[PDB]
Amino acid sequence: ADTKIWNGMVGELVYGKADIAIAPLTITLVREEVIDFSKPFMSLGISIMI
Amino acid sequence: ADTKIWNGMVGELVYGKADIAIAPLTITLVREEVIDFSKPFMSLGISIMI
Amino acid sequence: KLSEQGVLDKLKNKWWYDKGECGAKDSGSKEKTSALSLSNVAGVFYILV
Amino acid sequence: YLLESTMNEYIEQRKPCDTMKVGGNLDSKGYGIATPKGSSLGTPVNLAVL
Ligand SMILES: O=c1[nH]c2cc(C(F)(F)F)c(N3CCOCC3)cc2n(CP(=O)(O)O)c1=O
Hints:
The structure is cut from a larger assembly and holds four copies of chain A.
Chain A: H1 8-14, H2 29-32
The structure holds the ligand O=c1[nH]c2cc(C(F)(F)F)c(N3CCOCC3)cc2n(CP(=O)(O)O)c1=O.
Subcellular location (chains A, B): Cell membrane; Postsynaptic cell membrane; Postsynaptic density membrane
Protein name (chains A, B): Glutamate receptor 2
Binding site for L-glutamate (chains A, B): 24, 26, 31
């Protein structure tokens, strides 16, 4: 929030160090503005463990 | 297959009659080539009724 | 294309279940019954013998 | 009877309330909002859904 720079795999896509990211990367709104996401290959949610 | 003509809500978007389709339209491969889809707002699958 | 040919479903079954150590654990979750068994009334037979 | 899960949940909640759904979904698919190719609405609709 202070420096307005990305990190991680989203950072490497924006600043050019990589060309594609094949990883468990969640489709969110704030990530949608900077990079491009494909159609989802896996569906998930919150679950309960007992 | 014979006439190569789309019918329905998919047809109205291609030939120009309709501006947008808000409907339960399944994201498939064949429909992806002719028109554009957004991210899925609902997720479903095949289930069992007894 | 990979979604409609089931190749994503094929990879998910192999990595999650086929490399699973809890082998065929889903079969054990089925059985359920409620009645008296020998374990509840075993001491009465031991007094009888 | 094997059908889609969204209709399976709807018939369960209607009279005479005689049917139920068991198990989980067999496959995965989605419903998407459709626009014609090259339209100016495709980007604001996509950000609206997320
Ligand atoms: O895009 C994201 N995808 C993620 C995917 C996964 C996994 F499930 F492992 F794939 C996880 N984990 C869940 C359990 O703890 C270990 C890691 C975290 C993710 N996070 C971090 P969030 O902020 O907590 O969601 C993301 O941001």
